[PDB]
Amino acid sequence: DSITQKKFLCDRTLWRIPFSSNFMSMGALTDLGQNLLYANSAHALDMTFEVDPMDEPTLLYVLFEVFDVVRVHQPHRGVIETVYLRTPFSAGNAT
Amino acid sequence: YATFFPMAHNTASTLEAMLRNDTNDQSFNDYLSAANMLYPIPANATNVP
Amino acid sequence: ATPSMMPQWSYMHISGQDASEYLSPGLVQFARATETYFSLNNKFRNPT
């Protein structure tokens, strides 16, 4: 008399969750990212992960997918100027 | 080490003159384009908020 | 989408006009005429 066990293996990949309304990929800038409710205010975020036990210290590695761009401009001979921007989190300094 | 295309002087000067206007700038973006965080999971734990 | 960061977006070519429009006519004609051996396509955004 026997019992059954099932499992799956999936390496060389990262788990993805998109911030889109229908989960599809309709462009670089998802429609929810432009929604007024998430754009003209502030909100707090809470996440809860449940994993399986292991017998050594480990790390949970999270990637917030954002926009990161740089613009480079050089008016006169021997001059380089740049402007960096990361939209959801930070951009240089102020004042 | 570096390598230059041996482009003609008239064409190179014209391209240089055109690529200095305040509207023909250049742009780039990191392919991954994300911000990273690392949180510790102590041994034998199972819940991470 | 915020007029509070609308020029902030459109400046870095994150949204709005596309590459084949905000470039000078001379540069566009040049880049189209010298495509085969000295490319210039991967240095501009034209967002989506």
Tab-separated table of C-alpha atoms in Angstrom:
chain	number	residue	atom	x	y	z
A	1	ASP	CA	0.000	0.000	0.000
A	2	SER	CA	1.460	3.265	-1.212
A	3	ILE	CA	1.069	7.022	-0.878
A	4	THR	CA	1.812	9.763	-3.396
A	5	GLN	CA	4.009	12.858	-3.327
A	6	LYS	CA	4.190	15.737	-5.809
A	7	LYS	CA	6.578	18.660	-6.213
A	8	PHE	CA	7.987	21.061	-8.780
A	9	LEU	CA	11.380	22.630	-9.412
A	10	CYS	CA	11.887	26.050	-10.985
A	11	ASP	CA	15.366	27.598	-10.875
A	12	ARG	CA	17.016	30.402	-12.849
A	13	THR	CA	13.990	32.683	-12.565
A	14	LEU	CA	12.373	35.336	-10.393
A	15	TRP	CA	8.739	35.385	-9.367
A	16	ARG	CA	6.842	38.267	-10.970
A	17	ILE	CA	3.676	40.143	-10.035
A	18	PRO	CA	2.663	42.985	-12.380
A	19	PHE	CA	0.968	46.187	-11.257
A	20	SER	CA	-1.615	46.091	-14.026
A	21	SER	CA	-5.390	45.916	-13.956
A	22	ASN	CA	-5.735	42.685	-15.952
A	23	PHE	CA	-2.120	41.489	-15.329
A	24	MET	CA	-1.215	41.758	-19.018
A	25	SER	CA	1.694	43.721	-20.496
A	26	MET	CA	0.192	46.497	-22.624
A	27	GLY	CA	3.179	48.826	-22.394
A	28	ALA	CA	6.081	50.114	-20.373
A	29	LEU	CA	3.800	52.375	-18.319
A	30	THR	CA	0.860	50.414	-16.934
A	31	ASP	CA	-2.553	52.050	-16.723
A	32	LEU	CA	-2.726	51.674	-12.940
A	33	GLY	CA	0.515	53.626	-12.663
A	34	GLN	CA	-1.327	56.575	-14.207
A	35	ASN	CA	-4.488	56.153	-12.129
A	36	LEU	CA	-5.307	59.375	-10.311
A	37	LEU	CA	-5.938	57.598	-7.008
A	38	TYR	CA	-2.370	56.262	-6.883
A	39	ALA	CA	-0.860	59.438	-8.350
A	40	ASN	CA	-2.294	62.440	-6.462
A	41	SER	CA	-1.911	61.223	-2.873
A	42	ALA	CA	0.165	59.035	-0.564
A	43	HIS	CA	-0.455	55.534	0.757
A	44	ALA	CA	1.178	52.954	2.999
A	45	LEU	CA	2.028	49.424	1.904
A	46	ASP	CA	1.999	46.142	3.804
A	47	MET	CA	3.177	42.758	2.560
A	48	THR	CA	3.223	39.359	4.228
A	49	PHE	CA	5.255	36.429	2.916
A	50	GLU	CA	4.930	32.852	4.137
A	51	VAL	CA	7.658	30.390	3.142
A	52	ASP	CA	8.865	26.931	4.175
A	53	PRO	CA	11.327	26.435	7.039
A	54	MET	CA	15.058	25.983	6.554
A	55	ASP	CA	17.875	25.387	9.032
A	56	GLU	CA	20.202	28.278	8.175
A	57	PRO	CA	19.823	32.071	8.068
A	58	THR	CA	18.462	33.288	4.745
A	59	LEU	CA	17.344	36.428	2.926
A	60	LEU	CA	14.184	37.468	1.119
A	61	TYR	CA	15.112	39.485	-1.959
A	62	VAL	CA	12.523	41.949	-3.258
A	63	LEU	CA	12.681	44.042	-6.428
A	64	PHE	CA	10.325	46.984	-6.906
A	65	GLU	CA	10.183	47.500	-10.666
A	66	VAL	CA	10.350	51.236	-11.383
A	67	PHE	CA	11.538	53.704	-14.017
A	68	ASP	CA	15.210	54.699	-13.972
A	69	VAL	CA	16.449	57.053	-16.688
A	70	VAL	CA	19.311	59.423	-17.427
A	71	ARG	CA	19.521	62.322	-19.878
A	72	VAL	CA	22.934	63.465	-21.119
A	73	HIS	CA	23.604	66.859	-22.708
A	74	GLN	CA	26.815	68.634	-23.705
A	75	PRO	CA	26.496	72.179	-25.064
A	76	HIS	CA	30.087	73.420	-25.347
A	77	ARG	CA	33.373	71.724	-26.155
A	78	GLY	CA	34.721	69.627	-23.300
A	79	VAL	CA	31.643	69.815	-21.059
A	80	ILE	CA	29.327	67.035	-19.875
A	81	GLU	CA	26.071	67.555	-17.990
A	82	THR	CA	23.599	64.925	-16.848
A	83	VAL	CA	20.208	64.621	-15.183
A	84	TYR	CA	19.196	61.395	-13.429
A	85	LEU	CA	15.703	60.351	-12.429
A	86	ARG	CA	14.099	57.436	-10.609
A	87	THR	CA	10.384	58.123	-10.578
A	88	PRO	CA	8.674	56.317	-7.659
A	89	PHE	CA	11.448	56.578	-5.053
A	90	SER	CA	14.093	59.322	-5.309
A	91	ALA	CA	15.799	61.818	-7.601
A	92	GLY	CA	19.039	63.520	-6.565
A	93	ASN	CA	18.205	66.109	-3.900
A	94	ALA	CA	16.257	69.360	-3.539
A	95	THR	CA	16.750	72.928	-2.305
B	1	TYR	CA	42.258	51.154	-25.814
B	2	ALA	CA	39.762	52.931	-28.042
B	3	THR	CA	38.677	52.900	-31.678
B	4	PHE	CA	37.493	55.763	-33.891
B	5	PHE	CA	35.567	55.494	-37.123
B	6	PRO	CA	37.747	57.333	-39.678
B	7	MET	CA	34.809	59.444	-40.806
B	8	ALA	CA	35.221	62.359	-43.194
B	9	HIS	CA	35.908	65.708	-41.576
B	10	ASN	CA	32.970	67.591	-43.099
B	11	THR	CA	30.497	64.916	-42.024
B	12	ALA	CA	31.992	64.601	-38.543
B	13	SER	CA	31.943	68.366	-38.005
B	14	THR	CA	28.335	68.570	-39.193
B	15	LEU	CA	27.319	65.758	-36.844
B	16	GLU	CA	29.135	67.440	-33.955
B	17	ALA	CA	27.402	70.742	-34.675
B	18	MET	CA	24.002	69.055	-34.806
B	19	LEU	CA	24.462	67.009	-31.629
B	20	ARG	CA	25.085	70.062	-29.431
B	21	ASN	CA	21.669	71.731	-29.639
B	22	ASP	CA	19.673	71.735	-26.422
B	23	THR	CA	17.052	69.432	-27.976
B	24	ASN	CA	19.157	66.654	-29.524
B	25	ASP	CA	20.229	65.260	-26.163
B	26	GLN	CA	20.738	61.583	-25.380
B	27	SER	CA	18.820	59.257	-23.090
B	28	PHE	CA	19.431	55.894	-21.457
B	29	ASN	CA	17.714	53.539	-19.037
B	30	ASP	CA	18.980	50.588	-17.025
B	31	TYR	CA	17.593	47.370	-18.467
B	32	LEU	CA	16.550	45.888	-15.127
B	33	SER	CA	15.162	49.220	-13.878
B	34	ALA	CA	14.314	48.327	-10.301
B	35	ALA	CA	15.090	49.105	-6.675
B	36	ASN	CA	16.338	46.285	-4.465
B	37	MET	CA	15.636	45.342	-0.865
B	38	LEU	CA	16.932	42.515	1.310
B	39	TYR	CA	15.205	41.315	4.463
B	40	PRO	CA	16.634	38.760	6.903
B	41	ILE	CA	14.901	35.465	7.604
B	42	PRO	CA	16.157	33.883	10.839
B	43	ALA	CA	16.756	30.157	10.962
B	44	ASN	CA	13.594	28.005	10.982
B	45	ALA	CA	11.281	31.020	10.767
B	46	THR	CA	8.362	30.971	8.354
B	47	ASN	CA	6.555	34.351	8.416
B	48	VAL	CA	8.064	37.576	7.081
B	49	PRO	CA	6.182	40.894	7.255
C	1	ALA	CA	0.128	61.624	-14.792
C	2	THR	CA	0.431	64.937	-12.952
C	3	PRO	CA	1.026	68.497	-14.206
C	4	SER	CA	3.092	68.561	-10.992
C	5	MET	CA	5.449	66.076	-12.685
C	6	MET	CA	4.261	66.307	-16.305
C	7	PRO	CA	7.295	68.221	-17.664
C	8	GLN	CA	9.273	65.995	-15.301
C	9	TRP	CA	8.052	62.998	-17.292
C	10	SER	CA	8.091	64.503	-20.784
C	11	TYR	CA	11.617	65.833	-20.218
C	12	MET	CA	13.170	62.372	-19.867
C	13	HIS	CA	11.118	61.062	-22.822
C	14	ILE	CA	9.096	58.818	-20.522
C	15	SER	CA	5.853	59.863	-22.237
C	16	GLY	CA	4.548	62.150	-24.944
C	17	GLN	CA	6.301	62.831	-28.235
C	18	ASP	CA	8.286	60.072	-29.894
C	19	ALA	CA	11.866	60.089	-31.158
C	20	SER	CA	10.939	60.588	-34.811
C	21	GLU	CA	9.266	63.868	-33.854
C	22	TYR	CA	11.253	65.746	-31.197
C	23	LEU	CA	14.563	65.532	-33.085
C	24	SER	CA	15.852	68.203	-35.425
C	25	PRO	CA	15.031	67.526	-39.102
C	26	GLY	CA	18.694	67.521	-40.090
C	27	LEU	CA	19.640	64.897	-37.519
C	28	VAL	CA	16.709	62.703	-38.559
C	29	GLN	CA	17.702	62.894	-42.219
C	30	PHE	CA	21.326	62.147	-41.313
C	31	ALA	CA	20.490	59.128	-39.154
C	32	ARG	CA	18.237	57.791	-41.891
C	33	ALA	CA	20.878	58.319	-44.582
C	34	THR	CA	23.774	56.654	-42.711
C	35	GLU	CA	21.977	53.691	-41.177
C	36	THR	CA	23.941	50.771	-42.600
C	37	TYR	CA	27.475	51.236	-41.285
C	38	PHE	CA	27.201	53.751	-38.419
C	39	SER	CA	23.961	53.207	-36.540
C	40	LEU	CA	22.333	55.700	-34.188
C	41	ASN	CA	19.117	53.958	-33.122
C	42	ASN	CA	19.912	52.758	-29.599
C	43	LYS	CA	20.627	56.231	-28.169
C	44	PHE	CA	17.035	57.527	-28.041
C	45	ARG	CA	13.856	56.527	-26.239
C	46	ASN	CA	10.544	56.984	-28.148
C	47	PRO	CA	8.541	55.715	-25.167
C	48	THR	CA	5.410	53.585	-25.001
